[PDB]
Amino acid sequence: MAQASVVANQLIPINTRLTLVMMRSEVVTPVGIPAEDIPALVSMQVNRAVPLGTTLMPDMVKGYAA
């Protein structure tokens, strides 16, 4: 496994706009949103509560298409 995904660095409450301290990069399985996309995720809103350590998936971010 070499692809890193975006993983929640703290609990992200439902409907929170993402900030840089909320997102770390980690190689996890299954793969989620590419770690490379963390720039493009700032200020985007999550549509569900994301617990600490959870992989951010495409379907959890409102407006994410990439």
Short mmCIF file of N, CA, C and O in Angstrom, two decimals:
data_model
loop_
_atom_site.label_atom_id
_atom_site.label_comp_id
_atom_site.label_asym_id
_atom_site.label_seq_id
_atom_site.Cartn_x
_atom_site.Cartn_y
_atom_site.Cartn_z
N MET A 1 0.95 -1.10 0.00
CA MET A 1 0.00 0.00 0.00
C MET A 1 0.99 1.15 0.00
O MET A 1 1.99 1.06 0.72
N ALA A 2 0.81 2.12 -0.87
CA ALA A 2 1.67 3.29 -0.92
C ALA A 2 0.80 4.55 -1.03
O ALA A 2 1.23 5.65 -0.65
N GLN A 3 -0.43 4.45 -1.55
CA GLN A 3 -1.29 5.61 -1.64
C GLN A 3 -1.79 6.00 -0.25
O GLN A 3 -2.25 5.16 0.54
N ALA A 4 -1.61 7.27 0.04
CA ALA A 4 -2.06 7.83 1.30
C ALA A 4 -3.41 8.49 1.09
O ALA A 4 -3.67 9.10 0.05
N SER A 5 -4.27 8.42 2.09
CA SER A 5 -5.58 9.03 2.08
C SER A 5 -5.68 10.12 3.13
O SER A 5 -4.87 10.21 4.08
N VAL A 6 -6.71 10.93 2.99
CA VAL A 6 -7.06 11.95 3.98
C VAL A 6 -7.75 11.21 5.13
O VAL A 6 -8.68 10.42 4.91
N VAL A 7 -7.27 11.43 6.36
CA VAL A 7 -7.80 10.82 7.57
C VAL A 7 -8.08 11.95 8.56
O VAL A 7 -7.31 12.91 8.69
N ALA A 8 -9.22 11.89 9.24
CA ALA A 8 -9.63 12.89 10.22
C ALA A 8 -8.67 12.91 11.40
O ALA A 8 -8.41 11.90 12.06
N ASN A 9 -8.11 14.08 11.66
CA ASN A 9 -7.16 14.30 12.73
C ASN A 9 -7.85 14.69 14.02
O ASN A 9 -7.22 14.80 15.07
N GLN A 10 -9.17 14.89 14.00
CA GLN A 10 -9.99 15.18 15.18
C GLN A 10 -11.41 14.82 14.80
O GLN A 10 -11.66 14.52 13.62
N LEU A 11 -12.37 14.81 15.72
CA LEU A 11 -13.75 14.57 15.34
C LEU A 11 -14.18 15.80 14.55
O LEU A 11 -14.00 16.93 14.99
N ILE A 12 -14.70 15.58 13.35
CA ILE A 12 -15.22 16.64 12.53
C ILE A 12 -16.75 16.53 12.67
O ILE A 12 -17.33 15.55 12.17
N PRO A 13 -17.43 17.45 13.38
CA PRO A 13 -18.89 17.42 13.55
C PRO A 13 -19.60 17.56 12.21
O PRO A 13 -19.08 18.14 11.24
N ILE A 14 -20.82 17.04 12.13
CA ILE A 14 -21.62 17.14 10.93
C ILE A 14 -21.76 18.60 10.55
O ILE A 14 -21.85 19.50 11.39
N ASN A 15 -21.67 18.82 9.25
CA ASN A 15 -21.79 20.13 8.63
C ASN A 15 -20.64 21.09 8.88
O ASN A 15 -20.72 22.26 8.49
N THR A 16 -19.52 20.63 9.45
CA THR A 16 -18.33 21.47 9.59
C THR A 16 -17.60 21.71 8.27
O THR A 16 -17.53 20.82 7.41
N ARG A 17 -17.12 22.93 8.06
CA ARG A 17 -16.29 23.26 6.91
C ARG A 17 -14.88 22.82 7.33
O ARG A 17 -14.38 23.13 8.42
N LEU A 18 -14.21 22.06 6.47
CA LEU A 18 -12.92 21.50 6.77
C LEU A 18 -11.82 22.53 6.88
O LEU A 18 -11.79 23.48 6.09
N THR A 19 -10.95 22.41 7.89
CA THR A 19 -9.77 23.27 7.98
C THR A 19 -8.54 22.37 7.92
O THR A 19 -8.62 21.15 8.14
N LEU A 20 -7.37 22.96 7.66
CA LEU A 20 -6.13 22.21 7.57
C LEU A 20 -5.77 21.40 8.80
O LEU A 20 -5.20 20.31 8.65
N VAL A 21 -6.07 21.85 10.03
CA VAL A 21 -5.71 21.04 11.19
C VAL A 21 -6.61 19.82 11.33
O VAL A 21 -6.33 18.92 12.12
N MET A 22 -7.69 19.74 10.57
CA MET A 22 -8.55 18.58 10.69
C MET A 22 -8.11 17.40 9.85
O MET A 22 -8.66 16.30 10.00
N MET A 23 -7.10 17.55 9.00
CA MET A 23 -6.80 16.52 8.02
C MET A 23 -5.35 16.08 8.04
O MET A 23 -4.43 16.90 7.87
N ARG A 24 -5.11 14.79 8.23
CA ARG A 24 -3.76 14.27 8.13
C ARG A 24 -3.71 13.31 6.94
O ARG A 24 -4.73 13.01 6.32
N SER A 25 -2.52 12.86 6.58
CA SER A 25 -2.29 11.97 5.47
C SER A 25 -1.83 10.65 6.07
O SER A 25 -0.94 10.62 6.94
N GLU A 26 -2.40 9.53 5.63
CA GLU A 26 -2.06 8.24 6.20
C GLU A 26 -2.31 7.11 5.22
O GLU A 26 -3.25 7.23 4.43
N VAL A 27 -1.53 6.02 5.20
CA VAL A 27 -1.79 4.94 4.25
C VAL A 27 -2.71 4.01 5.02
O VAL A 27 -2.38 3.49 6.09
N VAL A 28 -3.92 3.91 4.52
CA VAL A 28 -4.98 3.18 5.19
C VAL A 28 -5.71 2.38 4.13
O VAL A 28 -5.61 2.72 2.94
N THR A 29 -6.43 1.33 4.54
CA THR A 29 -7.18 0.49 3.63
C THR A 29 -8.58 0.41 4.21
O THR A 29 -8.68 0.15 5.41
N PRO A 30 -9.69 0.59 3.47
CA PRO A 30 -9.72 1.04 2.08
C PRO A 30 -9.20 2.46 1.80
O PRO A 30 -9.02 3.27 2.71
N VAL A 31 -8.92 2.77 0.55
CA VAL A 31 -8.38 4.08 0.23
C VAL A 31 -9.56 5.04 0.21
O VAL A 31 -10.68 4.65 -0.14
N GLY A 32 -9.34 6.27 0.64
CA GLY A 32 -10.35 7.32 0.61
C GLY A 32 -9.91 8.44 -0.33
O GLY A 32 -9.28 8.21 -1.37
N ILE A 33 -10.24 9.68 -0.03
CA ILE A 33 -9.82 10.82 -0.85
C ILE A 33 -8.29 10.92 -0.81
O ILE A 33 -7.72 10.77 0.28
N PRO A 34 -7.57 11.10 -1.93
CA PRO A 34 -6.12 11.14 -2.00
C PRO A 34 -5.59 12.24 -1.11
O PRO A 34 -6.10 13.36 -1.16
N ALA A 35 -4.54 11.96 -0.34
CA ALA A 35 -3.92 12.94 0.55
C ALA A 35 -3.53 14.23 -0.15
O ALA A 35 -3.58 15.34 0.40
N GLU A 36 -3.22 14.08 -1.44
CA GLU A 36 -2.85 15.18 -2.31
C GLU A 36 -3.96 16.23 -2.44
O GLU A 36 -3.71 17.43 -2.59
N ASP A 37 -5.22 15.80 -2.30
CA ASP A 37 -6.36 16.69 -2.40
C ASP A 37 -6.65 17.50 -1.15
O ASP A 37 -7.58 18.31 -1.21
N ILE A 38 -5.92 17.38 -0.03
CA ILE A 38 -6.18 18.18 1.18
C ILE A 38 -6.29 19.68 0.87
O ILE A 38 -7.27 20.27 1.34
N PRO A 39 -5.43 20.35 0.08
CA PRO A 39 -5.64 21.71 -0.41
C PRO A 39 -7.04 22.06 -0.89
O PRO A 39 -7.63 23.06 -0.47
N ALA A 40 -7.55 21.19 -1.76
CA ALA A 40 -8.84 21.38 -2.41
C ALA A 40 -10.04 21.12 -1.50
O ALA A 40 -11.17 21.48 -1.84
N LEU A 41 -9.81 20.56 -0.31
CA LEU A 41 -10.87 20.27 0.64
C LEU A 41 -11.17 21.35 1.66
O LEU A 41 -12.25 21.38 2.28
N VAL A 42 -10.24 22.28 1.89
CA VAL A 42 -10.42 23.34 2.87
C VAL A 42 -11.63 24.18 2.47
O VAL A 42 -11.82 24.51 1.29
N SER A 43 -12.46 24.41 3.48
CA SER A 43 -13.72 25.14 3.44
C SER A 43 -14.86 24.34 2.89
O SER A 43 -15.98 24.85 2.83
N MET A 44 -14.64 23.08 2.51
CA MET A 44 -15.74 22.27 2.02
C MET A 44 -16.39 21.62 3.22
O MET A 44 -15.75 21.41 4.25
N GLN A 45 -17.69 21.39 3.14
CA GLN A 45 -18.46 20.89 4.26
C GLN A 45 -18.65 19.37 4.25
O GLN A 45 -18.85 18.77 3.20
N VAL A 46 -18.52 18.71 5.39
CA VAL A 46 -18.80 17.27 5.45
C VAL A 46 -20.27 17.07 5.74
O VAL A 46 -20.92 17.87 6.42
N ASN A 47 -20.88 16.02 5.18
CA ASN A 47 -22.31 15.81 5.32
C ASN A 47 -22.68 14.84 6.43
O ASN A 47 -23.85 14.50 6.64
N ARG A 48 -21.67 14.43 7.19
CA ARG A 48 -21.82 13.54 8.32
C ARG A 48 -20.70 13.74 9.29
O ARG A 48 -19.69 14.35 8.95
N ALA A 49 -20.89 13.27 10.52
CA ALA A 49 -19.87 13.36 11.56
C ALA A 49 -18.75 12.41 11.18
O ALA A 49 -19.01 11.26 10.79
N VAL A 50 -17.51 12.89 11.25
CA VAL A 50 -16.36 12.06 10.92
C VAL A 50 -15.57 11.89 12.21
O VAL A 50 -14.96 12.84 12.69
N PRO A 51 -15.58 10.74 12.88
CA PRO A 51 -14.76 10.49 14.06
C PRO A 51 -13.27 10.53 13.79
O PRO A 51 -12.83 10.23 12.67
N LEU A 52 -12.48 10.91 14.81
CA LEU A 52 -11.03 10.85 14.81
C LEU A 52 -10.52 9.51 14.26
O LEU A 52 -10.99 8.41 14.60
N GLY A 53 -9.59 9.63 13.32
CA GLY A 53 -8.97 8.46 12.74
C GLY A 53 -9.77 7.89 11.57
O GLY A 53 -9.31 6.90 11.02
N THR A 54 -10.90 8.47 11.15
CA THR A 54 -11.70 7.94 10.05
C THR A 54 -11.17 8.43 8.71
O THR A 54 -10.82 9.61 8.58
N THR A 55 -11.14 7.55 7.72
CA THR A 55 -10.78 7.94 6.37
C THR A 55 -11.88 8.77 5.73
O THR A 55 -13.06 8.41 5.80
N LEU A 56 -11.54 9.93 5.16
CA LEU A 56 -12.52 10.74 4.45
C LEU A 56 -12.79 10.12 3.09
O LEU A 56 -11.88 9.90 2.28
N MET A 57 -14.05 9.80 2.84
CA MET A 57 -14.44 9.24 1.57
C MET A 57 -15.09 10.29 0.68
O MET A 57 -15.62 11.28 1.22
N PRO A 58 -15.12 10.16 -0.66
CA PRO A 58 -15.75 11.11 -1.58
C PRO A 58 -17.18 11.51 -1.22
O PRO A 58 -17.54 12.68 -1.22
N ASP A 59 -17.96 10.51 -0.83
CA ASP A 59 -19.35 10.70 -0.45
C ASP A 59 -19.58 11.42 0.87
O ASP A 59 -20.72 11.69 1.24
N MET A 60 -18.54 11.75 1.63
CA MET A 60 -18.72 12.44 2.89
C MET A 60 -18.56 13.96 2.74
O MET A 60 -18.87 14.73 3.65
N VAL A 61 -18.08 14.45 1.60
CA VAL A 61 -17.81 15.86 1.40
C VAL A 61 -18.80 16.40 0.38
O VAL A 61 -18.86 15.93 -0.77
N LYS A 62 -19.57 17.41 0.80
CA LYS A 62 -20.52 18.06 -0.08
C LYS A 62 -19.79 18.85 -1.16
O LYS A 62 -18.88 19.64 -0.87
N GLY A 63 -20.09 18.61 -2.43
CA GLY A 63 -19.46 19.31 -3.53
C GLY A 63 -18.16 18.67 -4.00
O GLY A 63 -17.52 19.19 -4.92
N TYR A 64 -17.71 17.57 -3.41
CA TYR A 64 -16.48 16.96 -3.85
C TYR A 64 -16.74 16.18 -5.13
O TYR A 64 -17.57 15.26 -5.20
N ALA A 65 -15.96 16.54 -6.13
CA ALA A 65 -15.91 15.82 -7.38
C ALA A 65 -14.45 16.07 -7.78
O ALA A 65 -13.92 17.19 -7.73
N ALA A 66 -13.76 14.97 -8.05
CA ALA A 66 -12.35 14.96 -8.39
C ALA A 66 -12.13 13.50 -8.72
O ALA A 66 -12.05 12.66 -7.82
#
